[PDB]
Design a protein around this ligand. Structure first.
Ligand SMILES: *[C@@](=O)([C]([C][C][C])[N]C(=O)[C]([C][C]([C])[C])[N]C(=O)[C]([N]C(=O)O[C][C]([C])[C])[C]1[C][C][C][C][C]1)C(=O)[N][C]C(=O)[N][C](C([N])=O)C1=[C][C]=[C][C]=[C]1
Ligand SMILES: [Zn+2]
Ligand SMILES: [Zn+2]
Lengths: 22, 181, 151, 16
């Protein structure tokens, strides 16, 4: 069969952050 | 600090299909949980202590596409309904829950953390019921204790009239038993 | 990326606003009855509640709503205007004790911010710091219920 | 005078 593919991720280690302006 | 999560899609349908066949994935990895797919379904996989675990009912006995080509499962336990591959280089691992917490938090493929009240070593009730559709695609996802440690992996939903009120999980202990066997 | 907490300011001060249930909530003692700016002109508050020290405008752009708490936890976390997280033990309906008192300056400019539960869901809105001799040891907050009610 | 948004905070820390 075909391989299992990572199509995205979920990050739990992120901390509240001020969104940088761009 | 509180449990917060965010999701990022790393590849589309066509890229997924080519990668599935070639078995060679060159994308960079990040995160504790990986959104995973096969030609038939999409679910989650959780890295715990250097191993990327997920549900056997999802991964079957498949290899995982990595930068070096396909990677054979390290652990496979049809009975435990678990499969594990070496955690991808780049991923961050969760650690098993030390304190036996009664209040758990399920992280969905949408990066929402929903609280569940433990009602057994393998079950917990959603404090706030959600449609069964909301939970689709989250099998293999982690159930975290307040400290963010892995208590289990989402396996099945106790659905009724299309609404899930409880969830069945593979407690983090079955992992050790699976590695031991 | 969309944010749940807006760092806002009037001519007088600077504080925070938190989007919960599609509404951008903040403290009446910061906004008053002020209208919120938008690229299409000022938008009036959808809710004004002087007694609860609560006001609300429709959620702005570049924002995402927070989910109210449903696990009744007492282990709260306050997020400051500097993105700092402060553990707070819920001492009551609308009161909580910092697990580690901080100088009042540390909390200054955070009214309107959220008090998150272990799941990052909204427990309440930081209303005012309760301090002794310039050191904040506790905080006052607007329980999400009030918001759910005001709506 | 209006209340103006001078910045934003993403709780999960999503860089995206
Ligand atoms: C998971 O594997 C899912 C989570 C959906 C709830 N789990 C299951 O499908 C399991 C598999 C069996 C082998 C345990 N079944 C169930 O959870 C079923 N309940 C059940 O067996 O209950 C028993 C209890 C008493 C222990 C429910 C019953 C109601 C209907 C749904 C099954 C998972 O997420 N799989 C991936 C997936 O569903 N992908 C979908 C897809 N087509 O790719 C999908 C993804 C994203 C959005 C929609 C659909
Ligand atoms: Zn724990
Ligand atoms: Zn909660």
């Amino acid at each position: 069969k075909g391989s299992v593919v990572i199509v995205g991720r979920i990050v739990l280690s992120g901390k509240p952050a001020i969104i940088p302006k761009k | 600090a509180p449990i917060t999560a965010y999701a990022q899609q790393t590849r589309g349908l066509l890229g997924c299909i080519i990668t599935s066949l070639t078995g060679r994935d060159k994308n960079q990895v990040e995160g504790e949980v990986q959104i995973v797919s096969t030609a038939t379904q999409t679910f989650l996989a959780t890295c715990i202590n250097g191993v990327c675990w997920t549900v056997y009912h999802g991964a079957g006995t498949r290899t995982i596409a990595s930068p070096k080509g396909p990677v054979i499962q390290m652990y496979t336990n049809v009975d435990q309904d678990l499969v594990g591959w070496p955690a991808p280089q780049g991923s961050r691992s969760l650690t098993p829950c030390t304190c036996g917490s009664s209040d758990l938090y399920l992280v969905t493929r949408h990066a929402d953390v929903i609280p569940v009240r433990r009602r057994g070593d393998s079950r917990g009730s959603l404090l706030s019921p959600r449609p069964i559709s909301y939970l689709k695609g989250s099998s293999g996802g982690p159930l975290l204790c307040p400290a963010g440690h892995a208590v289990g992996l989402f396996r099945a939903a106790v659905c009724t009239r299309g609404v899930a009120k409880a969830v069945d999980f593979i407690p983090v202990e079955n992992l050790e038993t699976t590695m031991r066997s």
